[PDB]
Structures are given as structure tokens and as C-alpha cells.
Amino acid sequence: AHAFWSTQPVPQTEDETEKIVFAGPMDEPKTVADIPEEPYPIASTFEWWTPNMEAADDIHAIYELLRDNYVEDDDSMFRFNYSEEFLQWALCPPNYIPDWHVAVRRKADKKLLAFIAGVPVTLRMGTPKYMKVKAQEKGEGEEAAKYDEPRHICEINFLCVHKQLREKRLAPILIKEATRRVNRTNVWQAVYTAGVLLPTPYASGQYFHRSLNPEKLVEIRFSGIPAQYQKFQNPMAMLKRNYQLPSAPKNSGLREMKPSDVPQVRRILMNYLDSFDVGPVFSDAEISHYLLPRDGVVFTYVVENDKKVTDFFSFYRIPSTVIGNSNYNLLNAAYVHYYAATSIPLHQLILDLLIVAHSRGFDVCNMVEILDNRSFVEQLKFGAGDGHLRYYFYNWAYPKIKPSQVALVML
Ligand SMILES: CCCCCCCCCCCCCC(=O)SCCNC(=O)CCNC(=O)[C@H](O)C(C)(C)COP(=O)(O)OP(=O)(O)OC[C@H]1O[C@@H](n2cnc3c(N)ncnc32)[C@H](O)[C@@H]1OP(=O)(O)O
Ligand SMILES: CN1CCC(N(C)c2nc(N3C=CC[C@H]3CC#N)c3sccc3n2)CC1
Ligand SMILES: [Mg+2]
């Protein structure tokens, strides 16, 4: 059934994942010395390429590959169109490893044919709370706590093979070469998400959306007027009214984050994330990188009253190409990123996120039911989508957990 994933150090079945009690590695300990120094073999017509992410032109080539060949919805109505500014942000965080960005080009014309990216992350990935309890009950605490320390691992994203090169087993070769490059830096685990079901997720959550521009969403068939709107004389008018938001934020004290906020944001975020079983640990430089506002990419607001930052939220933009329609050629989506509330209810904080996103011309707000995202779904009129995001580790045995115990946002 899985000619590639059966050869890899991942859980092979759902059962296996449901049996796992303690976090830890799957494969045998290896050193950097054990790992081949030479790139994985590839067909003579292709070549490995390491793009320079601080080269506008290299970013551009990656951008076009993804624009034309990255994830679509199941109806081929929308294809993500991550911007070049977004890709530089995502691909080049503090202390990134240039060699973890792996491309394949056709040797002749040097056409970019495939890509995968890895970036560093520091992740808490030790045994979940409810397994450390079963463990104490069992007299098995030391084993349960062995890998409690945050680990410096790899987060994989943006795997993409050109449409003309599909179903030729190129994706496995990319994954093998990325693994080699990561392993050669003495990193042995990776975390990745996908919409598809592979062997084998440790958590899975539904997608949710909140309409901001229902008129447009209906036009492009992102949305359809649901059946109960038919018993109305003007269904569209009732839909627009349903999703209407204030023109201006409601929280006094709300403003954009600035560099001086970085310590307080790091502290309140770390306190909040601490509480989930799987979650990132950020340095000040990483808080700066992932949360300070960047035009068209990431938008972050703090609640400061009394010279004190008590709350914040962030969202990032990913537009999609609208493949079919031609009144509109882009869907402009805002995604809930990190947040922390200490002074106001989370629904009141995130309402301001929707107000701001709508004000700035976003069409829809998306999120997965990670973090405490479920706590504001109904009041803020989110609906579940058809999709799920599945979370996976490479080379890491981990108990199945609920998505509300996951605190890692993946771009
Ligand atoms: C320690 C360091 C480790 C670092 C590595 C950690 C692992 C990282 C793992 C990657 C995490 C990526 C996270 C994201 O970026 S998820 C986003 C993935 N990208 C897209 O969906 C973009 C559009 N689709 C494509 O570009 C291609 O269809 C891809 C590249 C997805 C497959 O290309 P193609 O369609 O031409 O197929 P093939 O003949 O070459 O290959 C067939 C094999 O590929 C397995 N497959 C299919 N889809 C995925 C998928 N999304 N993750 C992992 N494996 C996948 C499939 O089960 C089969 O294996 P097996 O069933 O036969 O066994
Ligand atoms: C690897 N990733 C591709 C883009 C995905 N992203 C950004 C997304 N995905 C959505 N998917 C709905 C079905 C599965 C999944 C696609 C995949 N893969 C949805 S649904 C609404 C927003 C949204 N965003 C986030 C990480
Ligand atoms: Mg292929």
C-alpha cells in the first residue's frame, strides 16, 4: 500500500499510535558520521539545487512553482498563492539552515521542478499530561519524562512537485534528500502537517472559516447560500447582515505590536503555550520574526492599557488563485496565528481580529481547531469546513492527542 512510507521511521497504523504511551525516537541512534556525505542519487537529467532565500530571484522561482503547482482544494477551484514576501518570512526565520531548502531543477533549461523546505523549530514534544499520569499510577514516571526538554528539530513545509512530473516517485526522493540534509546537522526528528491522510498522524483537527465578505465568497463558490436562507425574500441580503462586523475594534488599548513589546508578548505567549502538550518555544528573535507586523504578510495587535501588554493576537495572509471565476481572481484569507488573552475573554479578543481583518479587506478568516480555537467558534460565527489538518512527526513515537492539546501553528 505505501511503498515509500512503509520504509520510513513513522507509526505504520492507527492502532500502533493508539498503543504508544511514551514520547521518544523510533529509529536506532545514529551520528552525523553514519549519514552519507553525498546527495541522494537523482536522474542524470535533473540536479539538486539549494535556493538562496536572500536572493529575490530565487524566491521568485519558488513562488512561481508554488503559484502554479501547490495545494488546490478538491474541486480545483482554488490554489494557494503564497506571496514572495510570505515565502521569505516563512523560509528564513532566525538561525535557519540554508541547506534545508531543497530543490530539483531540470539541468538543461534549469526549470524548477520540485521543492521542499525545512526550517528550525524548538518544540515541546514530550509525553502528554494524561500519559504522564497513567505513568505515575504505573510507577513508570522516569521513562515518561525522558524527552521532556524542548527539542531543536525541523519543521517541513512547501513540498511541491511540478504538475507535469506527478506520480513519478519524485516526492520520496525529495523527502530522502531533505532527511539526509537535516540528519547531517544532527537533527533526527521533524514535524509536518498535511491535509491528506498518511501513516500516521498524532493529531487531526477540522478547518473552520468565518465569512468576512459573504457577497464575494458566494460569487466564487467558496460559499453557498445555505438552504434555510431560501425561505427568505432576499437570501443574499440576510447573509450579508448575518456576517456584518463593526468598522472599528472594540477593545480600548488595541494597537499594532512594535519591537518594544517583544519581551512582554514572549512572556504571555510562553505562559499560554506552556499548557498544551505539543507546542513551540520561541526566543525573543523568533517572537520578533514571527509576530512583528510585516506588510501584506503578518498582522499583530496588542492590548495595552496602563503601559502593560496584557493580551495580543496575530493573523497572517495567504491569498488563493480563483481558478474558475473571472469577476475575481484572488481569495484573500486571514489565518488565526498565535494569541494570548489574560485580561479579556478570548471571544472578545478574537472579535477584534475579525474586525481588523475585515477592515483591511480580507474575505475570510480561517483556522484549525488547535489551541483554544473551539472556544470562540459559535459566538464568532465560524463554521467547520470539509477539510482536516493532520499533524505528523518523523522519527518520533507519540500518543494520539486531541487537536486542542496542540499549540503549533503551521503556515
Ligand atoms: C529528521 C528530518 C526528516 C525530514 C523529512 C520529514 C518528512 C516530511 C514529509 C513531507 C511533509 C510535507 C508536508 C507538506 O508540504 S503538505 C503539502 C504537500 N504538497 C501538495 O499537496 C502540493 C501539490 N501536490 C504535489 O505537489 C504532489 O502531489 C506531492 C509532492 C504532494 C506528491 O507528489 P506526487 O503526487 O507526484 O507523488 P510521487 O509519485 O512523487 O510520490 C508518491 C508518494 O508520496 C506520498 N505523498 C503524497 N502526498 C504527500 C504529502 N503531502 N506528504 C508526504 N508524502 C506524500 C504518497 O503517499 C506516496 O508514498 P507511498 O504512499 O507510496 O508510501
Ligand atoms: C501543507 N499545507 C497546505 C496549505 C494548508 N492551508 C493553508 C490550508 N489548507 C486547507 N486544507 C483544507 C483541506 C486540507 C488542507 C490542504 C492541505 N495540505 C484549508 S481549508 C481553509 C483554509 C485552508 N488552508 C496549510 C498547510
Ligand atoms: Mg513524482
Side-chain angles (χ1 to χ4, degrees), residues 2-5 158-161 166-167 169-172 192-193:
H2 293 294
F4 168 70
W5 283 110
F158 301 109
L159 168 65
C160 182
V161 167
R166 299 275 177 89
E167 313 211 292
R169 309 311 289 184
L170 188 52
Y192 50 104
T193 56

Side-chain angles (χ1 to χ4, degrees), residues 297-317:
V297 177
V298 63
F299 306 82
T300 303
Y301 291 74
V302 297
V303 176
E304 172 176 72
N305 296 287
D306 216 305
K307 309 194 204 156
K308 182 190 181 33
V309 171
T310 53
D311 319 80
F312 82 101
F313 65 72
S314 179
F315 63 91
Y316 57 82
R317 168 169 183 268

